[PDB]
Amino acid sequence: VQLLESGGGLVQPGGSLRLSCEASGFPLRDYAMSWVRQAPGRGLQWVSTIGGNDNAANYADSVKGRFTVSRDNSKSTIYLQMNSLRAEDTALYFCAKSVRLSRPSPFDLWGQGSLVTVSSASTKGPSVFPLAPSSKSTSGGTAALGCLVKDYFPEPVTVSWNSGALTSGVHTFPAVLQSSGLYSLSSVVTVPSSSLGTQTYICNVNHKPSNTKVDKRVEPK
């Protein structure tokens, strides 16, 4: 069973945005469905619930009159249509399935989250630079290498290595907000020094708000 969310991204303050959550592996019509959000650095907040019929909706006070929750059982999808957005609405939005139809929780399945960023700043794709391993007579038996992903807005960026074939030893750091208002992060991996002449290392960088996809080869020297 899965909940697949879509619709996240950058939206202007005062703007509207619709999130959707598609059920797979269970009949949507049989369960109450909810939206729960996590603002940056804060906890979980319930936003809305829809029961079996479109008219059985409940809302947090701070979204009543602005947000509408609804369902289309024929398409196995739940929706959250948002209006008049403000910075306080910036958050990771989860959809959540109830164990039953007649009560809104416990929430026994949650979507992966869609990030909604409410801001007037423009989208900007990152520049990708190599963090090259040391390959000299004098370096050690383990090599570190990486990619620096600099100057992008909004979050998020995702990074993989070798199209996902390399996972062990990878660390992708949380982004930092720079003085410029743009984000930057690095992704690193440790590998055997003996592999550097033999094995290609490529970081795969995706920034969907800017339709940026970058494969960068990271080599010694």
Partner: protein, 212 residues
């Protein structure tokens, strides 16, 4: 609303230890109380519902108790994968509410960082900026002092750090410190050095390169 207050806000204990997490409600919620685990950047997971009922597929080390206004989540023997924020949640009344969370940290044995330093790439220098990166890899505890020196002058105000979440299998951290300079400033100086102080190191360790 029914306010849920969790304590302690943070809890640091070693694998194998018993962990007791508290949730207090401002008015009775009967047994209409559930518990969720949230591990970094994964979807939340139901652990306990109806105050005491273990959800399907959840390990037996997790248990819940209580009623009315006082509830507890117990992890009888902690495992490294239990690093997470844990939340309680009531369904007695609208609005549905959550507590503020208890962050559980796994207290492993001391591990010194493996330190690496990276010069700026030639590609970046074309842009007019130079980023120098120092990596502290796979260490515990989280506290670490990183100092940048350029031609043996201590730098202040021109670096930013980032730290990973605790690893779910080995409970270590990694940390990056990025020094940002003008290309012109970078090309003026020769020796770039990151000095690391950490409880796992008997004396500070320095990694350096010479520009060129």
């Amino acid at each position: 609303e029914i306010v849920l207050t969790q304590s302690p806000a943070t809890l640091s204990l070693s694998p194998g230890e018993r962990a007791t997490l508290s949730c207090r409600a401002s008015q009775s919620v009967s047994t209409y109380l559930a518990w969720y685990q949230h591990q970094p950047g994964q979807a939340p997971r139901l652990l306990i519902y109806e105050a005491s009922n273990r959800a399907t597929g959840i390990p037996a080390r997790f248990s819940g108790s209580g009623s009315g206004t006082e509830f507890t989540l117990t992890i009888s023997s902690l495992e490294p994968e239990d690093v997470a924020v844990y939340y309680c949640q009531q369904r007695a009344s609208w609005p549905l509410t959550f507590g503020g969370g208890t962050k559980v940290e796994i207290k492993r044995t001391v591990a010194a960082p493996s330190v690496f330093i990276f010069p700026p790439s030639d590609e970046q220098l074309k842009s007019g900026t130079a980023s120098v990166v120092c990596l502290l890899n796979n260490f515990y505890p989280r506290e670490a002092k990183v100092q940048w020196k350029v031609d043996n002058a201590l730098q202040s105000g021109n670096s930013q750090e980032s730290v990973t979440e605790q690893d779910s299998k080995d409970s270590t951290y990694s940390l990056s410190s990025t020094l940002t300079l003008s290309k012109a400033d970078y090309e003026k100086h020769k020796v770039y050095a990151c000095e690391v102080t950490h409880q796992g190191l008997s004396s500070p360790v320095t990694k350096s390169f010479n520009r060129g």
